[PDB]
Structure 1
């Protein structure tokens, strides 16, 4: 519906989210993903760390700069899962990937916008309680991601500003609710109730 949909990546399964996002991009919807460092993957941390090291050992023998490129950042890990679900070698696939943006944290342009979630990909709604899972932020650090602390510091600063904004918004909402309640019990309110509004 919205011209741009911003998805908060916290608490989403990587594969389930990537499948949903890839289909949206091919259907013509622009998608922005934020907080890629809070993504989850099913299975314990050690098991997923072994999987990435299996990916690390794959490289072109005669020239390593030709072989598969191993990106360490959480946003790039999600991008790899997404690109594998798109025919990226075609012009149609290239156009779809140009309608997608992935960021660690919430950069300033999108920190004042509305974020949504994908219920089909949420860990708390999919995984059986008690099952082990890993966070993409700690997995990236163990394989050579250098900017975990910088993102954490910036996120803490953003949340302080966002909490102050919510305090003013909450107080304004209470004032609006009181005026609507007082404006009820009138003839206009009675007619609206009969029509469902």
Structure 2
């Protein structure tokens, strides 16, 4: 499997590249997911993700959009949105993915990778927020 360090990276571009990988048949691990950035303004982003959390099915909430509050799950969910989820192909591609907060010991002592196309260096604007900030706002653990 390939190991990718989200640290200084942009979420959507990271996810686009990773999803193409997954479909072309690889295994991907993402570490330090709390350290990716989201671009925009803080009020806008928080409003978006709160409005998403408070969506649910009025008749039975044991159904319902289960939109997450943790950082690793935020990342995993973006990637999912970038795949065909209603198809065996997509379900297998998605099962070939794993996302972690931090760097577990299991992966410690190994050389990571970084996607060129996604990186904070491209930016010209001091306006960015972190996924960990979003998670703290929403009430998630780490």
TM-score band, normalised by shorter chain: over 0.9
**Mind listing any 5+ residue stretches in structure 2 that lack a counterpart?**
none
Match of 1:52 among 49, 53, 68: 49
State which structure, 1 or 2, has the greater radius of gyration over its C-alpha atoms: 1
Equivalent positions of 1:1-197 (< 5 A) are 4-125=1-122, 127-128=123-124, 130-147=125-142
Q: Displacement of 1:89 after TM fit?
A: 2.0
Q: Displacement of 1:52 after TM fit?
A: 0.5
- Equivalent pair of 2:38/2:128 in contact (CA under 8 Å): yes
Q: Displacement of 1:56 after TM fit?
A: 2.0
- Equivalent pair of 2:33/2:101 in contact (CA under 8 Å): yes
Matched position secondary structure for 2:117 = helix
Superposition CA RMSD, Å = 1.1
The alignment covers a number of residue pairs equal to 142
Q: Which has the higher contact order (CA 8 A, sep 6+)?
A: 2
- Equivalent pair of 2:41/2:128 in contact (CA under 8 Å): yes
Q: Displacement of 1:131 after TM fit?
A: 3.6
More helix per residue: 1
- Distance in 1 (CA, whole Å) between partners of 2:54 and 2:140 is 18
Stretches (4+) displaced over 3 A = none
Name the residue aligned to 1:152.
none
Under a length normalisation based on structure 2, what TM-score does the superposition of the two structures give? 0.95
- Distance in 2 (CA, whole Å) between partners of 1:117 and 1:41 is 17
Q: Displacement of 1:144 after TM fit?
A: 1.0
- Equivalent pair of 1:43/1:131 in contact (CA under 8 Å): no
Q: Which one is further off, 11-20 or 42-51? A: 42-51
Q: Displacement of 1:38 after TM fit?
A: 0.2
Matched position secondary structure for 1:26 = helix
